[PDB]
Amino acid sequence: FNETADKYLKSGSAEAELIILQYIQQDDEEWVYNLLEKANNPYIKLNALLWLSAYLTQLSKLWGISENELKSLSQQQPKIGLFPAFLAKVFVYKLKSEEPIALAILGDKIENFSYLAQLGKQNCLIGFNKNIQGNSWQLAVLATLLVKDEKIISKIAYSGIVLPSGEIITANLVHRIKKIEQLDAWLNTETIPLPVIQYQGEENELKRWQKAMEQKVQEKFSWFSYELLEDFYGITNSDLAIFGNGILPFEANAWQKLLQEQVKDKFKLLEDKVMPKKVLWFYAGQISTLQLGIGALFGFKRAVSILQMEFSNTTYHEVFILYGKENARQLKNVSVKKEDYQYIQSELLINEPHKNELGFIIYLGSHNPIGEAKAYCQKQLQINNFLIIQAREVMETSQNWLPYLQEINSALNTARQEYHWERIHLFQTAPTALCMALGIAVGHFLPVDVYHYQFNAPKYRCVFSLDKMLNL
Amino acid sequence: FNETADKYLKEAELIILQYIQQDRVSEDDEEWVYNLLEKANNPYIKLNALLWLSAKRKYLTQLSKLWGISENELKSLSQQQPKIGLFPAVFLAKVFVYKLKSEEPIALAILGDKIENFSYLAQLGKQNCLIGFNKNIQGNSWQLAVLATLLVKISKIAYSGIVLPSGEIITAEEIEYKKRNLVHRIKKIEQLDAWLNTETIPLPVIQYQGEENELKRWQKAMEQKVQEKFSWFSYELLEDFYGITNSDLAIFGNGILPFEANAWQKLLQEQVKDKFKLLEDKVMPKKVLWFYAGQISTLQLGIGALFGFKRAVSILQMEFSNTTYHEVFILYGKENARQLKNVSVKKEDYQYIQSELLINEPHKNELGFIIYLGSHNPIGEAKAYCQKQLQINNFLIIQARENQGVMETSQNWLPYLQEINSALNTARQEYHWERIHLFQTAPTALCMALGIAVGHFLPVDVYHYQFNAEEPKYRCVFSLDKMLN
Amino acid sequence: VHRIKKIEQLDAWLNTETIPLPVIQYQGEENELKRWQKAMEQKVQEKFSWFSYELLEDFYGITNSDLAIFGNGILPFEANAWQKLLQEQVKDKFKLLEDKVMPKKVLWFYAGQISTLQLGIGALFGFKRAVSILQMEFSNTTYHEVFILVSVKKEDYQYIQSELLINEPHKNELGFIIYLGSHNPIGEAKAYCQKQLQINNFLIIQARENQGVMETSQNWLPYLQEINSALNTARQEYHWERIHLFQTAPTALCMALGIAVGHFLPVDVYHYQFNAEEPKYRCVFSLDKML
RNA sequence: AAAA
RNA sequence: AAAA
């Protein structure tokens, strides 16, 4: 009791301090007042302060705080932040005052880092749980001050020293922060950009493509950073990269293995990691044909900025916008008739109406695949029904490419309205982003076997199937 | 009994409680009984002594003066009907609430240790009370039961937490031990007030076939959409207020549904058939505002047919530009649900769909109902399926009028379905159809609405399209008229 | 009288003039019947707050089952089953229930489930009983009294669109078709008469403006008045020895329709069963043969 | 037509 | 047409 409290005052034993803390929490104020000054353990100091919150006048006079606000700390539910030492805690208690007074109770002495209250836009009382040296706990308190939604942030820890002018100094852990505008948006946004890159080749090229893609994402979300993303969710560059060393083999099992190992579960895992907040996917790919599979695994249920690759200058140009004011559904608009076609021209040739097999040939890139795909379908698949989609008058990267995909889907469904096609065989030379958008739109519904073409290799080869993307 | 009370001060509590329950005590020791009301660690004894003193009107003036409670309120407490709240203990104990009319706010709590006036309880409850108890409880986690009994306009629900003068609620320790329906995941005064004094309980119901993580994501999105209109709603709050878990509200299966009519009918019977009935049984006294989204379009026509036109439902369609649901079908409130079944639209008065009726075999009483409001065209495949398999040449083809594949998620989708139903019943005007065959590429919410409107009253066999299947990819998964059987 | 909470409710029970008796017809699980009765209880309490199902079983002993024309599961599609259901339950229901509350009159509240059954119940209900026929509205799950129960010219027709065809003015068989819901019966009923009953004379009753949507916030008596005038109009010009009735009408409308033409016309009533093989129509009962 |  |  009182003797135990006096013994704990004159000793450094942790068991007595914990017992005193438990007794105070579950409910001799002179020893409690004395323990407030003798801040041997910050956890004991904070608990004693709340017991006094419900010598209140003396504490208010000495600490530069009010009286009603001081007694309002007992009736305030603290906000908890985590910062490394183990993982110590910062407790924020509500305080109302005119002058900004961010009273922080520390083991050394109670100090008022007034800049903290101004930055956090709320006067607060700061308590701790352990004797922590340094000022590395600034970031956790500031982050828990700038939060808007009411939820426990124990999943995220922060570390750093916040200087008065609004910058953080270095001491899941978040310690790569440098500006307060970064921290405010990393907790008070609802759409977290997830930049995903599909590259096959050297690791260094993937690295600098990821850097350029981070820059392009920052062009719209200036608060984003790969280091910050890894800090806040553990989503590393490898967690966002559809990678693999060397040239992918022409064997069909290789592409299916690549899709099932990485592409199949990547989006669902990443969206699980960013659990409460929505995701604005940013996608760039390398191999054109693979995207049709990737897009099929990506689906139409994701808001995506699809960006084109530029080899000359390593900069990304967004060509597909599927986010904003109901802009997503526009990719599935199939209302464009043949007469009002402004971008592509479609030729639907049918020579064997009794055969429900169609060769979907698309030429919106550089090399013309019509001859090769026609020979392949007439020699290795026995197909005489073709749907050739090409350009009218190669594609301006600056302009939006949504009409291309809209009219491609419209032509495909117009073909499907008047005939039954058991199998569709996709042979295309199209830009990577357009192939990805086509895979998103057409999806795993229509039976489509996509064949990839390699000029360095039996030039064509059935690489995957749209309907089987939900299986492999 | 004075001797029993003295023995308790120095089994005994049960004797006096039974003795005072029948009012077998005398007024000579009543003042001593008053001392018991101030010298009893068990709040039940103190509350019983207070009630006995109020009934007998003995020495109550001193207590009224000491507690700042009007004598009229103390007298009224004798004949007042105490409301009961339930809160867990270190079992589930009860809180007793008595009406009071004191000018000053006096939410007196007769605790075992000492009597304390939690005045802020009266402010939040908008009524002065005389809190009673039945056993000694350490920690004042009894706040939420009293607050719930105060905010009513009730033994099914129990509460646990601590309130603050701001109105916020904080839970206590031993939450896991206490949780071994118990409401402990609530934080706001408005949340409890609305959850208690609403008229319709939102019931977000989703149909999904896949993995549990994406089901959790979908349910979180549906919860956000519901909270947009009912900010007090929460899946945790629904779970501890009625026992309705996320599994109950989910028409869930693992992986891709097998492409067998037996599998689809088993899924309908095991989960869909009685889900709405049991959920409406759970929230018995209140009405239900079903918020519905689904995954497989064909399964909806059956889900809506079992759902019926007798339920007020907000059918939501997800807009993937912002990954937000939109209430595309509003069938509750001021918006009349009778307009769901408005078949008064003529063909010349169509503004959203384009409908045609081909009759090449008038002698045969069968036709193919093909709906194309999505993007992937089913007309060719379904027509080939009818002509090659079902031997059918009569067709009722419905597509979109202007913008095929894009139906504005911001606008109301009721006119689409109204015109579709009008076209169907105009086809049924001069013709008798023994069987109707339904092949659709239509939005999920529109399919559910069409199933609700058409119901089980028509001979309709619905043929699902399976992407990962061998030809034929159409198969009559169920019949609309056979769902009641 | 034991479950009485407020003295105000007790005062009205012993000193009222009319007692409301809510009668509901339902076929299916008894659990959903309990839900239907609870929704019916609220509508009565708008006009009689003192009314309660629990109190109804105390003063008189009327039980929720006693007020319910109830049968487990789907009613079998046999004419004998329908005639048994009307005879065993419906026919003696209203006469017996009135005798329970003998000193005071009865204001009947009614809402059914099977539209075709209401013609038999409405005919057997009688036109001497004051009735407040309800019709549930589903956007709010509430009941609305659409009926608070002739000689109207065709030109002065407000909401119905009557039509009379006499293609073979030789036989005296008439197909009475009433289309007020949203499922068109004209195609099926016309084909049923020609193929099975050999009938080509038809009287069609159809909504003039809003098919399937008649505002459940007003009085539906003018709707019924137009039907009686149109029906009686054909009888003066042509003598019908037997009229065959097919209807897709609201449940409340059919019950009031049976009251107007109860037992005084040779009318054949045909039900449509959704889960039945062709033919889906069957003469469940004849309106002139329940006496 | 497997949140269109 | 089985609370339209």
Beta bridge partners, A428, equal A362
Coil vs helix vs strand at A278: strand
Q: From the CB of residue B120, how many other CB atoms can be counted at a distance below 10 Å?
A: 17
> Residues with Cβ < 8 Å from B97, sequence gap 6 or more?
B82, B83, B84, B85, B129, B130, B131, B132, B146, B149, B150
Strand C160-166, strand C201-207: pairing: antiparallel
Q: Which H or E element spans position A390? A: strand A386-391
The answer to whether A140 and A158 have CB atoms below 8 angstroms apart is yes
B419 to chain A, any CB pair closer than 8 A? The answer is no
CA distances from A356 to A290, A422, C13 (A): 25, 5, 77
Locate tokens 């026995």: which residue?
A: A382
Strand E atom within 7 Å of B243 CB? no
Phi and psi torsions of B287, nearest 5°: -80, 165
Residue B132 Cα, gap to closest chain A Cα (Å): 22
Contact B377/A77, CB-based, under 8 Å? Answer: no
Give the length of chain C: 291
Task: Note whether B405 contacts A77, CB cutoff 8 Å.
Answer: no
Cα–Cα nearest to A293, from A248, A342, A345: A248
Residue B259 near chain A (CB below 8 Å): no
Beta strand pairing call for A357-363 and A423-429: parallel
Q: Which amino acid is at A198?
A: Q
Question: Within a domain: residue C205?
Answer: yes
Q: Tokens for B37? A: 């009301």
- This PDB structure is determined at a resolution in Å of 2.8
**For A74, nearest residue in chain B (alpha carbons):** B164
Cβ atoms within 10 Å of A285's Cβ, excluding its own: 24
DSSP lists the bridge partners of residue A452 as A461
Peptide linkage before C222 cis (omega within 30 of 0): no
Contacts of A301 (CB under 8 A, 6+ apart): B318, B320, B323
- Residue C10 CA, nucleotide E4 C1', distance (Å): 38
Task: Say whether B277 and C32 touch across the interface (CB within 8 A).
Answer: yes
Structure tokens belonging to residue A46: 């904070």
Same domain? For C15 and C136 the reply is: yes
On whether both C185 and C102 belong to a single domain, the answer is: no
Q: What is the DSSP string of A105-173?
A: --SS--EE-HHHHHHHTS-EEEEESS---SSTBHHHHHHHHH--S----TT-EE-BEEETTTEEE---E
DSSP for B372-420 reads E-SSS--HHHHHHHIIIII----EEEEEESSSTT---TTS--HHHHHHH
Domain endpoint, select from C122, C147, C172: C147
Choose among B362, C272, B472, B244: nearest CA to A420: B472
The structure tokens listed for A236 are 């590393």
Rounded to an integer, what distance in angstroms lies between the CA atom of residue B159 and that of residue B146?
A: 9
Same domain for C143 and C180, yes or no, is no
Give the orientation angle of helix C115-125 with respect to helix C91-100, to 10 degrees: 50
User: What's the token pair of residue A383?
Assistant: 């197909």
Reported in sequence order, the residue ranges of B221-312 that DSSP labels E, i.e. its strands, are 250-254, 287-293
CA gap A109, A433 in Å, rounded: 59
Would you say A356 and A421 are in contact if contact means Cβ atoms under 8 Å apart? yes
CA distance A107 to A113: 15
In chain A, where the domains are located: 2-182, 183-321, 336-470
Interchain CB contact of B15 with A (< 8 Å): no
Question: CA of B60 to nearest chain C CA: how many angstroms apart?
Answer: 29
Give the C-alpha separation, A383 to C253, whole Å: 62
Q: Are residues C135 and C65 in the same domain?
A: yes
Q: To 5 degrees, how large is the angle CA B164–CA B167–CA B169?
A: 65
Rounded to whole angstroms, the distance from the CA of residue B467 to the C1' of nucleotide D1 is: 8
For the record, the structure tokens of B320 come out as 């993937």
State the Cα torsion B371-B376-B380-B383 to the nearest 10°: -30
Q: Please give the distance of CA B166 from its chain centroid, rounded to a whole number.
A: 28
Closest-CA distance, A418 to chain B, in angstroms, reads 5
> How far does the CA of A282 sit from the C1' of E4, in Å?
51
3-state secondary structure of A206: helix
Rounded Cα gap, residues A303 and B24, in angstroms: 76
**From edge to edge, which strands make up the β-sheet containing A448-453?**
A344-349, A386-391, A357-363, A423-429, A448-453, A460-465
Is C155 part of any domain?
no
User: Using CA atoms, how far apart are residues C111 and B451, in angstroms rounded to an integer?
Assistant: 25
Asked if C104 and C166 sit in the same domain, the reply is: no
The domain at B80-197 falls in which architecture?
A: 2-Layer Sandwich (3.30)
B293 touches strand D (CB under 7 A): yes
C1' of nucleotide E2: residue with nearest CA: C114
Q: How far apart are CA B311 and CA B294, in angstroms?
A: 17
Are residues C142 and C12 part of one domain? yes
DSSP string, B108-141: EE--SS--EE-HHHHHHHTSEEEEB-SS--SSST
B310 CB near a chain C CB, below 8 Å?
yes
Give the CA count within 13 Å in the CB-facing half-sphere of B226: 26
3-state secondary structure of B370: strand
Are residue C207 and residue C135 in the same domain, yes or no? no
- Residue whose token pair is 């109204």: B418
Task: Quote the CA–CA distance of B184 and B174 in Å, as a whole number.
Answer: 11
- Give C61's contacts (C-beta < 8 A, 6+ positions apart): C100
Would an 8 Å CB–CB cutoff place B199 in contact with chain C? no
DSSP B371: E
Q: Give the bases of strand E that a protein CB approaches within 7 Å.
A: 1-4
| DSSP-assigned letter for residue C273 | -
Cβ-contact C133, C111 below 8 angstroms: yes
CA–CA gap between residue B261 and residue B126 (Å, rounded): 58
Distance of residue C181 Cα from the nearest chain B Cα, in angstroms: 8
Angle, vertex CA B377, rays to CA B372 and CA B380, nearest 5: 105
The answer to whether A303 contacts B318, with C-beta atoms less than 8 Å apart, is: no
Distances in whole angstroms, Cα of residue B350 to Cα of each of B401, B415, B416, B419: 9, 9, 9, 6
Identity at B258, one-letter amino acid code: P
Strands, DSSP E only, in C112-147?
131-137, 142-147
Residue B435 three-state SS: strand
* The pairing of beta strand C160-166 with beta strand C131-137: unpaired
Closest C1' nucleotide to B293's CA: D3
Residue B405 CB lies within 7 Å of the nucleic strand D: yes
- CATH number for the domain spanning C187: value is 3.40.50
Nucleic acid strand E within 7 Å of C25 CB = no
Examine residue C279 and say whether the peptide bond preceding it is cis (omega within 30 degrees of 0): yes
Tokens of B109: 């709590």
Q: Clarify whether residues C105 and C205 are in a common domain.
A: no
Determine whether the distance from the CB of B177 to the nearest atom of strand E is below 7 Å: no
Count of CA atoms in the C-beta half-sphere (13 A) of B273: 13
Contacts with C278 (C-beta within 8 Å, 6 or more apart), sequence order:
B365, B434
User: Which residues span the domain enclosing C105?
Assistant: 7-147
Q: Is A280 helix (H, G, I), strand (E, B) or coil?
A: strand
Sorted by sequence, the CB contacts under 8 Å of residue B150 that are 6+ apart come out as B97, B121, B124, B125, B126, B127, B129
A301, A310 in Cβ contact below 8 A? Answer: no
Q: Which residues pair with A423 in a beta bridge?
A: A357
Q: How far apart are CA B146 and CA B169, in angstroms?
A: 12
Distance CA B1, CA B170 (A): 41
d(CA C228, CA C127): 14
Residue burial A139-165, b: 16+ Cβ < 10 Å; e: rest: bbbbbbbbbeeeeebeebbbbbebeee
**DSSP string spanning C83-120?**
HHHIIIIIHHHHHHHHHHS-SSEEEEEEE-S-HHHHHH
The sign of the dihedral angle between the CA atoms of A18, A20, A21, A27 is positive
> How many domains does chain C contain in total?
2
- Taking alpha carbons only, the member of A125, A136, A140 closest to residue A93 is A125
Strand D and B149 CB separated by under 7 Å: no
Taking an 8 Å cut-off on Cβ atoms, the answer to whether B321 and A327 are in contact is yes
B178, B88 contact by CB (below 8 A):
yes
C96 and C216 in a common domain: no
Q: Where are the alpha helices (DSSP H) in B183-272?
A: 189-197, 212-229, 235-242, 261-267
Distance, in Å, from the CA atom of B161 to the CA atom of B192, rounded to the nearest integer, reads 12
Cα C247 from Cα C178, distance rounded (Å): 4
Report the distance separating Cα C60 and Cα C155, nearest Å.
50
As given in the structure block, the two tokens for residue B254 are: 């693992």
Classify the C-alpha dihedral C273-C220-C92-C3 as positive or negative. positive
Distances (CA, A) of A456 to A253, A428, B375, C171: 19, 17, 37, 87
DSSP state of A201: B
B257 CB neighbours strand D below 7 A = yes
Q: Which of residues 182-221 of B touch strand D (CB under 7 A)?
A: 206, 209-210, 217-218, 221
Residues in chain C after which the backbone breaks (C–N beyond 2.5 Å): 149
Task: In whole angstroms, give the CA distance from residue B295 to residue B288.
Answer: 22
What does the alpha-carbon distance between residue C148 and residue B268 come to, in Å, rounded to a whole number? 42
Contact A429, A366 (CB under 8 A): yes
Same-domain check for residues C121 and C189: no
Is A60 strand, coil or helix? Answer: helix
How many angstroms separate the CA of A8 from the C1' of D4?
Answer: 70
The structure's method of determination equals cryo-EM
Closest CA to B313 of B298, B293, B295: B293
User: C291 in a domain, yes or no?
Assistant: no
The closest alpha carbon to C186, from A119, B427, A182, B244, belongs to B427
In the structure encoding, which two tokens stand for residue B447, read together?
């399919």
